[PDB]
Swiss-Prot record:
The gene is Ryr2. This is Ryanodine receptor 2. It comes from the Eukaryota. It comes from Mus musculus. The calcium release channel activity resides in the C-terminal region while the remaining part of the protein resides in the cytoplasm. Belongs to the ryanodine receptor (TC 1.A.3.1) family. RYR2 subfamily.
Amino acid sequence: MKLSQDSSQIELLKELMDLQKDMVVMLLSMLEGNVVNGTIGKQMVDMLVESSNNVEMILKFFDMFLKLKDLTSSDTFKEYDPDGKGVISKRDFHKA
């Protein structure tokens, strides 16, 4: 949330997202031999419910940024300003 409010930190944001992807694939590699009532699943749901707030924030972030690829270039925004490379007055974008 902090690195997205201002520019000149897109490299830091990209490296942080890469680290997050590596962390999630690491903690996902812990379940490739899972059982319906294994201990690793209990430990993982425990560490999830102990930090429900932060994972909820990142889930809201991902949902907000995934509901944008389709909300824009599907109905009206693609034909709002058909000039060339993307130009928007940032006021029609708000109402869109």
